[PDB]
Design an enzyme around this catalytic site. Sequence first.
Site, PDB file in Angstrom:
ATOM      1  N   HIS A 482       0.823  -1.194   0.000  1.00  0.00           N
ATOM      2  CA  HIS A 482       0.000   0.000   0.000  1.00  0.00           C
ATOM      3  C   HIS A 482       0.871   1.263   0.000  1.00  0.00           C
ATOM      4  O   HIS A 482       0.923   1.957  -1.026  1.00  0.00           O
ATOM      5  CB  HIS A 482      -0.933  -0.060   1.208  1.00  0.00           C
ATOM      6  CG  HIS A 482      -1.971   1.013   1.237  1.00  0.00           C
ATOM      7  ND1 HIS A 482      -2.701   1.294   2.372  1.00  0.00           N
ATOM      8  CD2 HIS A 482      -2.389   1.885   0.289  1.00  0.00           C
ATOM      9  CE1 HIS A 482      -3.532   2.292   2.117  1.00  0.00           C
ATOM     10  NE2 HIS A 482      -3.364   2.668   0.859  1.00  0.00           N
ATOM     11  N   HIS A 487       1.010   5.118  -2.916  1.00  0.00           N
ATOM     12  CA  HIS A 487       1.243   6.473  -2.407  1.00  0.00           C
ATOM     13  C   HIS A 487       2.636   7.037  -2.712  1.00  0.00           C
ATOM     14  O   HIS A 487       2.767   8.064  -3.381  1.00  0.00           O
ATOM     15  CB  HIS A 487       1.011   6.486  -0.890  1.00  0.00           C
ATOM     16  CG  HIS A 487      -0.430   6.378  -0.502  1.00  0.00           C
ATOM     17  ND1 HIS A 487      -1.223   7.487  -0.314  1.00  0.00           N
ATOM     18  CD2 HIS A 487      -1.235   5.303  -0.323  1.00  0.00           C
ATOM     19  CE1 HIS A 487      -2.450   7.101  -0.005  1.00  0.00           C
ATOM     20  NE2 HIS A 487      -2.483   5.780   0.000  1.00  0.00           N
ATOM     21  N   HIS A 673      -4.182   0.529  -6.313  1.00  0.00           N
ATOM     22  CA  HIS A 673      -4.439   1.149  -5.022  1.00  0.00           C
ATOM     23  C   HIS A 673      -5.794   0.734  -4.479  1.00  0.00           C
ATOM     24  O   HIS A 673      -5.937   0.495  -3.278  1.00  0.00           O
ATOM     25  CB  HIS A 673      -4.373   2.677  -5.116  1.00  0.00           C
ATOM     26  CG  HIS A 673      -4.724   3.339  -3.822  1.00  0.00           C
ATOM     27  ND1 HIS A 673      -5.941   3.943  -3.599  1.00  0.00           N
ATOM     28  CD2 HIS A 673      -4.032   3.445  -2.666  1.00  0.00           C
ATOM     29  CE1 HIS A 673      -5.976   4.415  -2.364  1.00  0.00           C
ATOM     30  NE2 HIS A 673      -4.841   4.099  -1.767  1.00  0.00           N
ATOM     31  N   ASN A 677      -6.439  -1.032  -0.893  1.00  0.00           N
ATOM     32  CA  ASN A 677      -6.880  -0.054   0.083  1.00  0.00           C
ATOM     33  C   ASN A 677      -8.282  -0.314   0.644  1.00  0.00           C
ATOM     34  O   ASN A 677      -8.466  -0.257   1.861  1.00  0.00           O
ATOM     35  CB  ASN A 677      -6.817   1.350  -0.538  1.00  0.00           C
ATOM     36  CG  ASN A 677      -7.186   2.394   0.451  1.00  0.00           C
ATOM     37  OD1 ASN A 677      -6.408   2.690   1.341  1.00  0.00           O
ATOM     38  ND2 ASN A 677      -8.394   2.875   0.381  1.00  0.00           N
ATOM     39  N   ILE A 822      -6.937   8.485  -0.935  1.00  0.00           N
ATOM     40  CA  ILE A 822      -7.067   8.288   0.499  1.00  0.00           C
ATOM     41  C   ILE A 822      -6.093   7.190   0.904  1.00  0.00           C
ATOM     42  O   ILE A 822      -5.793   7.042   2.088  1.00  0.00           O
ATOM     43  CB  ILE A 822      -8.523   7.960   0.866  1.00  0.00           C
ATOM     44  CG1 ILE A 822      -8.760   7.986   2.372  1.00  0.00           C
ATOM     45  CG2 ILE A 822      -8.939   6.606   0.264  1.00  0.00           C
ATOM     46  CD1 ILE A 822      -8.499   9.313   3.031  1.00  0.00           C
TER      47      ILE A 822
HETATM   48 FE   LIG Z   1      -4.315   4.646   0.276  1.00  0.00          FE
END
Ligand SMILES: [Fe+3]
Length: 822
Positions: A482, A487, A673, A677, A822
Amino acid sequence: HKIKGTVVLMPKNELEVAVDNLNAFLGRSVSLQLISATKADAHGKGKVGKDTFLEGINTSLPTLGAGESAFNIHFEWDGSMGIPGAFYIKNYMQVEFFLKSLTLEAISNQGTIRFVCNSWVYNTKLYKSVRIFFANHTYVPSETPAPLVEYREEELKSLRGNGTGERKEYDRIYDYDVYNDLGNPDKSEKLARPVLGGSSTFPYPRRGRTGRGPTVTDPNTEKQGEVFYVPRDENLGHLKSKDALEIGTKSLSQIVQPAFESAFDLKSTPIEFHSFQDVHDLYEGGIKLPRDVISTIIPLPVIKELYRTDGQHILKFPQPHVVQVSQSAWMTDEEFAREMIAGVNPCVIRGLEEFPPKSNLDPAIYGDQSSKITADSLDLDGYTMDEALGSRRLFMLDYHDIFMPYVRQINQLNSAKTYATRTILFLREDGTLKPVAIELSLPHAVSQVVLPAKEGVESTIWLLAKAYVIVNDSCYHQLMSHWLNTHAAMEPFVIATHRHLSVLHPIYKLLTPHYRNNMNINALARQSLINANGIGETTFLPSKYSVEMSSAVYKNWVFTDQALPADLIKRGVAIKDPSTPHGVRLLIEDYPYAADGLEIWAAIKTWVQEYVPLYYARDDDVKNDSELQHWWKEAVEKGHGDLKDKPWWPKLQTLEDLVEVCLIIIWIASALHAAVNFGQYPYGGLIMNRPTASRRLLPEKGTPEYEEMINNHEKAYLRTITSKLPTLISLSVIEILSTHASDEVYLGQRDNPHWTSDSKALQAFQKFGNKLKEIEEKLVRRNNDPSLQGNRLGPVQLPYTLLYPSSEEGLTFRGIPNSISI
Ligand SMILES: [Fe+3]
């Protein structure tokens, strides 16, 4: 000789989470000046018109959205001025506003000229250069109208800055820095952390430069600040305060965590879970806390949405999906294996072509590391090892080499103890995976192999062995699958894109929707999640070594292996096969993440393959695009600069390279993602299913801890995993991270339908959205197919919906956003 225009904007307080005055926009408060695309001055620059002010409010416009206001304006524009292609805007008010669009009317359409702005505009005095906006026409650099060339270049220069200075809220300056902002050595020497990036010892992607300057005690570490800057238009406002999810992470660390801690210091609640029912209580009757704690938490925006409360004593967490049908199915070996291909972290399992598995670690330091698992100890449903290997039915979740370099350091920490684990899996004739052995290793308590058992103390040892595996997996999931792979790896491409591709550029228009809110959430994470004594170091096993471990894994990160087909082949879970639609056959046929993912992958590929040739006819047109070449050079040699020497970086000299690079970036930011996530709370909201830490090693026979294991297996399990206080904090953060904001933009959507004037691109984007709707119907059919229920639903009866493209708002276990939002 007048052009009618309509300006749409949103006043500041509509997007804030104390008064707006719409009449203050009239008068001489806001000037626009149109810039010609076709008539130039003596220096070759497009002629600029006169300052023109907003005339009045337009309420008769039907297409206005929530919080938007429209203003009329008329431009005097005579025959000497040509056709407008840009405009300047000057805000003379003391308050900033959010500019959405400008439209210029004509006799018919064309020539309606549309400008899509979506930018905050501060007071004219705060900018070194007057803000400029372009019409929505798309141009590679060589196709830019000559009177606009200098403006295009100037604006890119305003976005790069000069590499110096403290960044302020209204700056739009994109640049790179290393991860030297996570430690807090001025507060305490124990909060010092290594700089990540800029060395071969600790390579790391770069992040957005903030420029706050050095600490007093360490010149190489950046001082702390109340706000971590991002370029202004990366910092997203929301019409609804509940949608500012990224801010909830800061509130959790600043306000909520201290309040929870006070409840435990005052012994107002038991410090430990004592039974599995104490955990289930969290989403049934709730947890009882002091009134002052409740009253400190429930007034907070975003945070108040996370719990149900009676307003005085109770907080109740939502029921996690994984327990919605069966409260105990998570304990089955079937579900343990199934979540490796359909859970929160479904991308790590590998095929095993030889036995026993071998280590790559230095035999001088870690001694012999050959697996101690013997073939004769395994129940392979009547297969021999030779037959299982030959038929490609053996798989492995291998955390031995990743964790061994850190076990000694982690096990020295106060309340942390772990093993480096290996799990052997067998793909049964019915198509489901069976765990057949776990190996628990320590460098230099001993290193042992545990086999499955259903009765006796051995069945509890096996249950605990699975817990140690999932502690390994949870840590790897959060920090690598993750944080690192999505990110952190994406942020350098965001920065490079704004520095080197004009807003006019076709590839800017293709990629930038896939960046929405990515710098913003990352900056908030550096401040409150992955910082020294932050939420991640509080909740997850490696404590202060957490982020440094991700640097060690980044050493082996390969951009071109992020493509889904390449990933599957490199892990030995698929083989190349031109006979199949996607070019690969899955060695696990029903593998839900991979099978669904390959459909999404193919849809993105078709879109990129249809869009790129609209602007690049030949390999030459890629080579000669100066902006594209500068972009990719900087993304590799500065953004991922610690890896710039690696031979696998695409060269970007051909159409095929351009397609591949775009496709991988979009894949990472959207479906990859999403798949790692949005299952976090659904699967991990029950702490026993996804423990984040282990606190002790296996009890030795003859000890009281061993006797307890015989008489009370639930307490033995709870004593080993994440304790009660970090569980409450962790559950809160993964609830936030698993929630879709109501203003999310999903794959196949864009925030403005006029993002380009090119009808061919609009039509290709329509075919992309239609294809995604057809894929969703296909995935629904897969979840209704009885022949796939074993892997797609499992004993928990939870259909795999994480790669359904669409979703409503909330904690839905479905929906692919465009970006790492997010
Ligand atoms: Fe995330």
